[PDB]
Amino acid sequence: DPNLWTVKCKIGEERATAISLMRKFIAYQFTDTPLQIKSVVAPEHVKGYIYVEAYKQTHVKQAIEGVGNLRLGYWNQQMVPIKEMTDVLKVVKANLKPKSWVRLKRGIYKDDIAQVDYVEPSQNTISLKMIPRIDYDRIKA
Amino acid sequence: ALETVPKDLRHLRACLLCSLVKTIDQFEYDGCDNCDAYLQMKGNREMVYDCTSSSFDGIIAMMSPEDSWVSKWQRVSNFKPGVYAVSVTGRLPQGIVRELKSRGVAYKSRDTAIKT
Ligand SMILES: [Zn+2]
């Protein structure tokens, strides 16, 4: 059973980190310097450090050498105990389902609980059900 | 290979059979690399938007499914190494699951995420 290591990354650059290390692996699997990594875990609920799969601590050091996104947490590679290989894959309740209850972030109905009606397949806009709280143009000028 | 890596981070989805995480251009030009004779999602956009959805989370760089602890837990060890997901929510309609049982493909719920 392979071990899991924790490396430090830039905040905001998790998916770019994963999509860059995957292309390094594919860019070096056929040379004289391959990569000994199995996978790299990047949860969407975290922000700041990622997870990597390797048997020994020298493999992560000889695999992440040369990347500028992982140059900060390069001098230290923490190790998790074996019971933490499972809590990493757990996701608590994507988040796109009709007839559900979402809230707003910007606009006038901030932090107001609404409902979804229809979803646009273009992934551009979404239908919402809220209640207007305007004055019907009586108080404002 | 170079085809299973999504080129752009915008408009990417994940399937409900092998949790294949790619961009919307590769599911239409090439499709599901882990199932092409049972799904046939290359050559159109209705079948790509029908089975494969965007409601998914969690990203893993599967490289050696024959030797890794995560690949056996997600039952993705008999698949091609590449971009996969760990919780792909949703369900197939009662229009493509009936043909999968008669052909010998047991459609499993890949959603390992807990509900409340
Ligand atoms: Zn699939």
Swiss-Prot record, chain A:
Subcellular location: Nucleus
Limits of the KOW domain: 96-129
Organism domain of life: Eukaryota
Post-translational modification: Methylated by PRMT1/HRMT1L2 and PRMT5/SKB1. Methylation negatively regulates interaction with P-TEFb and RNA polymerase II. Phosphorylated by CDK7 and CDK9. Phosphorylation by P-TEFb (CDK9) at Thr residues of the C-terminal repeats alleviates transcriptional pausing and promotes transcription elongation. Dephosphorylated by the INTAC complex when transcripts are unfavorably configured for transcriptional elongation, leading to premature transcription termination: dephosphorylation is mediated by the PPP2CA component of the INTAC complex. Dephosphorylated by the PNUTS-PP1 complex in termination zones downstream of poly(A) sites, thereby promoting deceleration of RNA polymerase II transcription.
Region (Interaction with SUPT4H1): 1-93
Tissue expression remark: Ubiquitously expressed.
Cystine residue pairs: none
Coiled-coil region(s): none
Stated family: Belongs to the SPT5 family.
Function recorded in the entry: Component of the DRB sensitivity-inducing factor complex (DSIF complex), which regulates mRNA processing and transcription elongation by RNA polymerase II. DSIF positively regulates mRNA capping by stimulating the mRNA guanylyltransferase activity of RNGTT/CAP1A. DSIF also acts cooperatively with the negative elongation factor complex (NELF complex) to enhance transcriptional pausing at sites proximal to the promoter. Transcriptional pausing may facilitate the assembly of an elongation competent RNA polymerase II complex.
Subunit structure: Interacts with SUPT4H1 to form DSIF. DSIF interacts with the positive transcription elongation factor b complex (P-TEFb complex), which is composed of CDK9 and cyclin-T (CCNT1 or CCNT2). DSIF interacts with RNA polymerase II (Pol II); forms DNA and RNA clamps that stabilize Pol II elongation complex while maintaining the nontemplate DNA strand in the transcription bubble and nascent RNA in the exit channel. This interaction is reduced by phosphorylation of the C-terminal domain (CTD) of POLR2A by P-TEFb.
Protein name: Transcription elongation factor SPT5
Protein encoded by which gene: SUPT5H
Whole-protein residues included: 176 to 318 of 1087
Swiss-Prot record, chain B:
UniProt-listed InterPro entries: RPABC4/Spt4 (IPR029040), Spt4 (IPR009287), Spt4/RpoE2_Znf (IPR022800), Spt4_sf (IPR038510)
Chief localization: nucleus
GO BP annotations listed: negative regulation of DNA-templated transcription, elongation; negative regulation of transcription by RNA polymerase II; negative regulation of transcription elongation by RNA polymerase II; positive regulation of DNA-templated transcription, elongation; positive regulation of transcription by RNA polymerase II; regulation of DNA-templated transcription; regulation of transcription elongation by RNA polymerase II; transcription elongation by RNA polymerase II
SS bond partners: none
PTM remark: Ubiquitinated by UBR5 when not assembled in the DSIF complex, leading to its degradation: UBR5 recognizes and binds a degron that is not accessible when SUPT4H1 is part of the DSIF complex.
Subcellular location per the Swiss-Prot or TrEMBL entry: Nucleus
GO molecular function, one term: protein heterodimerization activity
Alphabetic keyword roster: Acetylation, Activator, Metal-binding, Nucleus, Repressor, Transcription, Transcription regulation, Ubl conjugation, Zinc, Zinc-finger
Binding site for Zn(2+): 15, 18, 32, 35
Positions carrying N-acetylalanine: 1
Domain of life, per lineage: Eukaryota
Region annotation Interaction with SUPT5H: where it falls in the sequence: 1-39
Record's subunit section: Interacts with SUPT5H to form DSIF. DSIF interacts with the positive transcription elongation factor b complex (P-TEFb complex), which is composed of CDK9 and cyclin-T (CCNT1 or CCNT2). DSIF interacts with RNA polymerase II (Pol II); forms DNA and RNA clamps that stabilize Pol II elongation complex while maintaining the nontemplate DNA strand in the transcription bubble and nascent RNA in the exit channel. This interaction is reduced by phosphorylation of the C-terminal domain (CTD) of POLR2A by P-TEFb.
PANTHER family listed in its UniProt record: SUPPRESSOR OF TY 4 (PTHR12882), TRANSCRIPTION ELONGATION FACTOR SPT4 (PTHR12882:SF1)
Protein name per its UniProtKB record: Transcription elongation factor SPT4
Species name: Homo sapiens (Human)
